[PDB]
Amino acid sequence: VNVPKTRKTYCKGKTCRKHTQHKVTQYKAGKASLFAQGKRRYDRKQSGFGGQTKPVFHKKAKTTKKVVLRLECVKCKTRAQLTLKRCKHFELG
Amino acid sequence: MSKITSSQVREHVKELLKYSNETKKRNFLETVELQVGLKNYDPQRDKRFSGSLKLPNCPRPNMSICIFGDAFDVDRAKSCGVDAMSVDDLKKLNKNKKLIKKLSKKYNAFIASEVLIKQVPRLLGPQLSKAGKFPTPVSHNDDLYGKVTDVRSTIKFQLKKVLCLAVAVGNVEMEEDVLVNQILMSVNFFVSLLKKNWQNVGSLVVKSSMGPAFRLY
Amino acid sequence: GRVIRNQRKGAGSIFTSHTRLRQGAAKLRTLDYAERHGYIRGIVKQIVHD
Amino acid sequence: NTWRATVQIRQKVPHKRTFLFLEQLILKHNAHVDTISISEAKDGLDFFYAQKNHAVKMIDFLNAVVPIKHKKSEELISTYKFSYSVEIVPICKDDLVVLPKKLAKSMGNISQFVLCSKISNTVQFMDPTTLQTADLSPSVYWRAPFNALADVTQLVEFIVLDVDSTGISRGNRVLADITVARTSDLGVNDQVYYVRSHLGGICHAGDSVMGYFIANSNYNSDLFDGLNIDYVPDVVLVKKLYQRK
RNA sequence: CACGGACCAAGGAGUCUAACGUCUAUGCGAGUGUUUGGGUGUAAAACCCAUACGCGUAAUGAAAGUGAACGUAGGUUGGGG
RNA sequence: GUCGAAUUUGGGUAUAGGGGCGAAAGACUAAUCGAACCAUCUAGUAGCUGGUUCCUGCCGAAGUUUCCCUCAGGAUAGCAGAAGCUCGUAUCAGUUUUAUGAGGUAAAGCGAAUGAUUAGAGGUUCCGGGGUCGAAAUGACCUUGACCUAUUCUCAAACUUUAAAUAUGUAAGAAGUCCUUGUUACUUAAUUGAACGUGGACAUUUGAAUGAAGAGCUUUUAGUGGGCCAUUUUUGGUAAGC
RNA sequence: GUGAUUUCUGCCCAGUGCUCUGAAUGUCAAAGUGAAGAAAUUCAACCAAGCGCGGGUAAACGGC
RNA sequence: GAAGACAUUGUCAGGUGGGGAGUUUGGCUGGGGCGGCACAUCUGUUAAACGAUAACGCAGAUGUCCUAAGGGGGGCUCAUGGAGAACAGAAAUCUCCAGUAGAACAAAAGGGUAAAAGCCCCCUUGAUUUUGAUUUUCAGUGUGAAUACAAACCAUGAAAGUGUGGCCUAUCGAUCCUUUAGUCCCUCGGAAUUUGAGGCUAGAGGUGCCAGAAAAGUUACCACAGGGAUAACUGGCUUGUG
Ligand SMILES: [Mg+2]
Ligand SMILES: [Mg+2]
Ligand SMILES: [Mg+2]
Ligand SMILES: [Mg+2]
Ligand SMILES: [Mg+2]
Ligand SMILES: [Mg+2]
Ligand SMILES: [Mg+2]
Ligand SMILES: [Mg+2]
Ligand SMILES: [Mg+2]
Ligand SMILES: [Mg+2]
Ligand SMILES: [Mg+2]
Ligand SMILES: [Mg+2]
Ligand SMILES: [Mg+2]
Ligand SMILES: [Mg+2]
Ligand SMILES: [Mg+2]
Ligand SMILES: [Mg+2]
Ligand SMILES: [Mg+2]
Ligand SMILES: [Mg+2]
Ligand SMILES: [Mg+2]
Ligand SMILES: [Mg+2]
Ligand SMILES: [Mg+2]
Ligand SMILES: [Mg+2]
Ligand SMILES: [Mg+2]
Ligand SMILES: [Mg+2]
Ligand SMILES: [Mg+2]
Ligand SMILES: [Mg+2]
Ligand SMILES: [Mg+2]
Ligand SMILES: [Mg+2]
Ligand SMILES: [Mg+2]
Ligand SMILES: [Mg+2]
């Protein structure tokens, strides 16, 4: 699918509150090790004797993924997110 | 790199503009180019990245772009007063194999017709792209003078087998603050183009085309 | 499974050596001053089966 | 309940390329001498046999042409029907594969990001970026199986702009380096790609070549996302079209 | 032609506890609960009692926090007496 | 069978339970051995089998819906009992009539447009699907089929023009009708409407029939969640108590 | 492992094992090293055996 | 005598390790297994003229595709046949007449559509923000999909209007854990500042056994708790003539 990298939509910033122009990028993610409560809990549960202690998922069925767009306002610098359907090829031409 | 309080580049640009024409008032060859060497990246192991980051500020006015096209863009090129070419002319150019390797040297670039560029891939044969002169297309309703201005002001960072990419980023003519804006734009484009957004860039140098000993970057 | 036979041979219960009719351990004379500096003479009295 | 032997050949792929090669080879050797009947299916076919001798020699013939795994099953009527379930390895030639890490390390320390280059009684993978092959056997596949990344439907076209070389060849394949562009924006953009490939001796500047475009791709694969980002390329080139007329 | 049963006597299987829901009875009622303890005794009973504490009389919010009358504590439709 | 030895045997001594010992049978280890015996944890757990103790009265079922690593089991709804509470002939019904909707099966008709599987001969640069090679394209090697070509009668549960019977939704008034004129931040060009009202008029029938064992409402909980047979209409299997 | 005597025990090291008088970073843990940071930390280089590459072995399993 | 700050010994770390330990080894099903998915969905038929209705019944589809193939406006008419025009010959381009759709509308089938929902152009981003109500499956829970308003901001058009993705009927996913967007936001409890962490509102990362365990065989050496198996009787068949 093709989506242009510019789009005029509504933004809910306190200064704008109207239809403004945004530019479009795609969303990605990160992670954290000596920070997050789940990781700090899992490591202590994992230490010692006993084995694995949590499930491990290996029965993947989907082959594609939904795509999320991040929109940044050119006059406000207030981002917004918008999800699309499942597609196999995506670009921002 | 992530930008580093550009007053050092400001003093370097001032020393370069006092080197050119204030200690050697040479003939008009103003081109204050920025040379950048990258560090900590393997050419074969990493992807060979490239982009073009065309700033409208111009420094190389004398350029050769033999507009290859059809009849209507030939008349448009004759109006814009630039060196054009014809269809039978390009057919003779692909006929004589030695003429292409010379016409790639008598020209400085090229600008093709969105009606004949999907043939320069095969008709005008190889070594044009090896000399990095693959023509950029121009439409049937866009301005030819504006496209020639853009093809004279369009700079392109490409990753070769060497980590020493240099670009004619400015002229030594004038406009210290506009030159500072050009240096900021080039540094931003290189830092965003590299894989690590700050760490990979090592060597930055200014040289006003005269083998000047004023880099200070 | 269970403990196999070559594993069982190391506890040494019914796998020890049968040493009743043996004449004694066969070894050389202890090194001392006479063998270290000169020589000494003995005599062989009997040649036996072990 | 009237045959006593059934052989069921299956391949769980929409585009059954290895299965159609197998059908051409069965038709070109005429191994279907003693078939009672043939049942079509969605992913293969069933051959029928009056005694199990022709069935086991069909298994013997199939065990040396294609990478398969077969299992035996016993039926009762109240004298015993037999059923032979044969599965072909669902990886066809010119398909793009990400390998498991331990298998890739044990199979010659090859890259995980490979291409299926030849199918025989075993299967053969090859790294297109550096010319290097590997042989995977059906039993070591079926010990812990995996799937392919992309099949031959998302092959996009590419226009070759320029060729170089590196000198290294391993016979029939000259590992070179070519600059290329897409035929959906060659007359639109200034976007060029630089691909180190094994289509160096076969390709010259100005023609069309099929490939995988990784930079426009939504891949949901744990083997893929366990890779590194910089060591996966943008384009993987597979084959040249070259239509005469 | 399913399983148990030769005959007789005796024994033999929804119990108790902690915390609860609905319904009923009783005592007091914006309150209610003496029995952890103390006083006393005809002595494991009965009788008497202080300060606390539990539940109820205020909700809502993840929290910081805020916290229930425009009016005969409102208008319309029915409504036993 | 063997009977002078890889013989037979007394006593002493050594090897102990996931251990021993085995010229090997999973053999033997105190009538116990594909992991001995003894006591305790221990009244181990059991969606599985058996049993479960006095009388009379009144009421009285289900084998079905949805979800569950569910199918010899649960939760949930239904069916049932008990406690009642607010009131007093309501406006209700496994029914008819009158009025007014919806349907596309039986029958008709195909020949009025759809009228079919089946074994169906060639016509190659009218198509060609792919499969194997190929330092690649005046590029070789393969076979289902494209298209029935100059063949019609033939008929339908997935075809249509008409169209029953049986079964099905709504209405048959007081929470109604009519006249007059109050509210509004909605609506109209408006003094128009829309919704809700004030005041007034209309009971011997208050707007078809027949019936009405009181009507309405709430809380709580049991068992059940293997069904089967008959007439009629049907689907799959020559067909069956399939 | 084979199973008195007699006679015959062919060829393959490729697959799986077992092995090593062979090359050198391909993978490469804790500890130690360096950089940025106020610091907790983050990033990077180096990196033992083993694995991988290379050689041996069939009266090893197999294969013809 | 030999060896020597090396072995040895202690702690952590990386390999190797059925020698040993513990555990597991889906469901439906004319018995299991193989096959298939009748396991989550969609169209026609079974299906007997409201709705509902089973079978490992039948004919097929789904895990996609699209910045236009979404939205608004304007102009035009499609398949096909006939008669004509140099090369022109089934079939190339032009002209006229007939043409109720026999064409097209991404994909299965069914429905719908002619100054259009089809074809060709012009402008665009309503495929936006905030949250309630309703319909289908239904326990009237969740998930998916859809309908009609309200309060904003926009598009298109002269305008009335239309527009909350695809003409309609399918195209998809909890808790826990990560991550992102937004709130001159709340907390770190002796008091502050800055990192770090935790919260609130709204999305993504996925469970296809699709209301959602993390999982290989063999037993003829076998064990336990239970449930089922035995003369032919078609509610009436069998004998000589495809
Ligand atoms: Mg540990
Ligand atoms: Mg001894
Ligand atoms: Mg009996
Ligand atoms: Mg008995
Ligand atoms: Mg008895
Ligand atoms: Mg009130
Ligand atoms: Mg004798
Ligand atoms: Mg021991
Ligand atoms: Mg015994
Ligand atoms: Mg019983
Ligand atoms: Mg009764
Ligand atoms: Mg009929
Ligand atoms: Mg009145
Ligand atoms: Mg129940
Ligand atoms: Mg039962
Ligand atoms: Mg070997
Ligand atoms: Mg480390
Ligand atoms: Mg090493
Ligand atoms: Mg030491
Ligand atoms: Mg082990
Ligand atoms: Mg085990
Ligand atoms: Mg089963
Ligand atoms: Mg069966
Ligand atoms: Mg019906
Ligand atoms: Mg449309
Ligand atoms: Mg819903
Ligand atoms: Mg989720
Ligand atoms: Mg399930
Ligand atoms: Mg389920
Ligand atoms: Mg048993």
CA distance B201 to B189: 12
For D91, the token pair is 């990886």
Of A60, A64, A93, the CB nearest to D218: A64
- Residue A74 exposed, middle or buried by CB count within 10 Å (0-12, 13-18, 19+): exposed
- Residue B116 exposed, middle or buried by CB count within 10 Å (0-12, 13-18, 19+): buried
Ligand 26: distance of its center to the CA of A66 in Å? 23
Put residue B209 in one of left, alpha, beta given phi > 0 → left and psi -120 to 50 → alpha. left
* 8 Å CB contact between A31 and A22: no
Half-sphere exposure of D144 (CA within 13 A, CB side): 6
* 8 Å CB contact between D45 and D6: no
Which among B154, B150, B196, B170 has a CA at the least distance from the CA of B49?
B196
Cα angle vertex D168, ends D162, D174, to 5°? 55
Is A67 at the interface with chain D, CB within 8 A?
yes
- Residue B35 exposed, middle or buried by CB count within 10 Å (0-12, 13-18, 19+): middle
CA distance A78 to A67: 20
Q: H-helix or E-strand containing D86?
A: strand D82-88
Q: How many CB atoms neighbour CB A35 within 10 A?
A: 9
Torsion of CA D199, D200, D201, D202, to 10 degrees: 40
Say whether D222 and A60 touch across the interface (CB within 8 A): yes
For D60, the token pair is 């013997």
CA distance D191 to D196: 17
Half-sphere exposure of D29 (CA within 13 A, CB side): 11
D28 phi/psi in degrees, rounded to 5: -95, -10
Ligand 22: distance of its center to the CA of D144 in Å? 25
| Covered bases, chain F (protein CB within 7 Å) | 14-15, 18-22, 24, 26, 35, 125, 130-139, 142-143
For strand F, is any atom closer than 7 Å to the CB of D163?
no
CA distance B204 to B201: 8
Give Cβ neighbours of residue D231 (< 8 Å, ≥ 6 apart).
B45, B46, D111, D113
CA distance D110 to D126: 9
CA distance B100 to B92: 10
* 8 Å CB contact between B58 and B149: yes
Q: How far is CA A93 from CA A3, B49, B148, D51, D234, in A?
A: 7, 18, 24, 63, 17
Q: Regarding beta strands D208-213 and D235-240, do their DSSP bridges make them parallel or antiparallel, or are they unpaired?
A: antiparallel
CA distance D210 to D203: 12
D214 phi/psi in degrees, rounded to 5: -75, -25
Question: What b/e readout covers B102-113, taking b as 16+ CB neighbours within 10 angstroms?
Answer: ebbeebebbbbb
Q: Across-strand partners of D88?
A: D68
The coordinates were experimentally obtained by cryo-EM
Q: How far is CA A82 from CA A85, D69, D211, in A?
A: 10, 46, 31
Q: How far is CA C2 from CA A13, C5, C6, C14, in A?
A: 77, 10, 12, 18
Q: List helix spans (H) across C1-50.
A: 5-8, 33-37
Ligand in nearest proximity to the CA of D75: 23
CA distance D9 to D25: 14
* 8 Å CB contact between D111 and D104: yes
* 8 Å CB contact between D237 and D188: no
* 8 Å CB contact between A21 and A7: yes
CA distance D198 to D234: 15
Torsion of CA B87, B88, B91, B95, to 10 degrees: -160
Q: Which of A1, A89, A90, A92 to mutate to test the interface with D (most CBs of D within 10 A)?
A: A89
Question: What b/e readout covers D120-154, taking b as 16+ CB neighbours within 10 angstroms?
Answer: eebbbbbbbbebbebebebeebeeeeeeebbbbee
Q: How many CB atoms neighbour CB A14 within 10 A?
A: 7
Give Cβ neighbours of residue B58 (< 8 Å, ≥ 6 apart).
B149, B152, B153
Ligand 25: distance of its center to the CA of C25 in Å? 108
For B52, the token pair is 């073009």
The tokens 């550009």 sit on which residue?
B6
Q: Regarding beta strands D5-10 and D82-88, do their DSSP bridges make them parallel or antiparallel, or are they unpaired?
A: parallel
Say whether B118 and D196 touch across the interface (CB within 8 A): no
* Backbone discontinuities in chain C, residue before each (C to N > 2.5 A): none
Distance from CA of D180 to the nearest CA of A (A): 18
For A73, the token pair is 């306002």
Resolution of this entry, Å: 2.6
For A19, the token pair is 């239809």
For A47, the token pair is 């230490």
Q: At what angle do helices B87-95 and B97-106 cross, to 10 degrees?
A: 120
CA distance B117 to B68: 9
Tell me the one-letter amino acid at D185: D
CA distance D149 to D155: 12
Q: How many CB atoms neighbour CB D223 within 10 A?
A: 18
The tokens 């990419």 sit on which residue?
B165
Distance from CA of B68 to the nearest CA of D (A): 14
CA distance D17 to B139: 43
Q: Which residues touch strand G (CB under 7 A)?
A: A 33-34; B 199; D 105-106, 108-109, 137
CA distance D202 to D197: 11
Question: What b/e readout covers B159-176, taking b as 16+ CB neighbours within 10 angstroms?
Answer: beeebebebebbbbeeee
Between CA D78 and C1' H235 the distance (Å) reads 29
* 8 Å CB contact between D153 and D15: yes
CA distance B18 to B39: 31
CA distance B49 to D158: 18
Running DSSP on this structure, what letter comes out for residue B37? E
Which among D86, D88, D121 has a CA at the least distance from the CA of D6?
D86
Give Cβ neighbours of residue B154 (< 8 Å, ≥ 6 apart).
B52, B54, B136
Which among D27, D142, D26 has a CA at the least distance from the CA of D85?
D142
Q: How far is CA B197 from CA B3, B200, D224, in A?
A: 11, 7, 24
CA distance A8 to A27: 19
CA distance D230 to D233: 7
CA distance B181 to B169: 11
* 8 Å CB contact between B127 and B139: no
- Cβ contacts from A onto D, under 8 A: 28
For A54, the token pair is 């949590």
Which among B48, B51, B53, B54 has a CA at the least distance from the CA of B159?
B48
Between CA D242 and C1' F125 the distance (Å) reads 19
Which among D73, D2, D74, D58 has a CA at the least distance from the CA of D26?
D58
Beta strands in chain A, from DSSP E residues, in sequence order: 6-11, 18-26, 65-73, 79-87
Ligand 14: distance of its center to the CA of D40 in Å? 48
For A15, the token pair is 């200064």
Say whether D220 and A63 touch across the interface (CB within 8 A): yes
Cα angle vertex B126, ends B71, B85, to 5°? 20
Give Cβ neighbours of residue B204 (< 8 Å, ≥ 6 apart).
B34, B35, B36, B187, B215, B217
Least CA distance to A67: which residue of chain D?
Answer: D218
For H69, nearest residue by CA–C1' is A1
Q: At what angle do helices B7-19 and B176-193 cross, to 10 degrees?
A: 120
Q: Is B102 in a helix, a strand, or coil?
A: helix
- Overall residue count recorded for chain D in this entry: 245
Q: H-helix or E-strand containing D21?
A: helix D17-29
For B155, the token pair is 């700079």
Q: List helix spans (H) across B35-120.
A: 72-79, 87-95, 97-106
Of D185, D218, D222, the CB nearest to A87: D218
Long-range contacts of B92-97 (CB under 8 A, 24+ apart): B93/B124, B94/B123, B94/B124, B94/B125, B97/B125
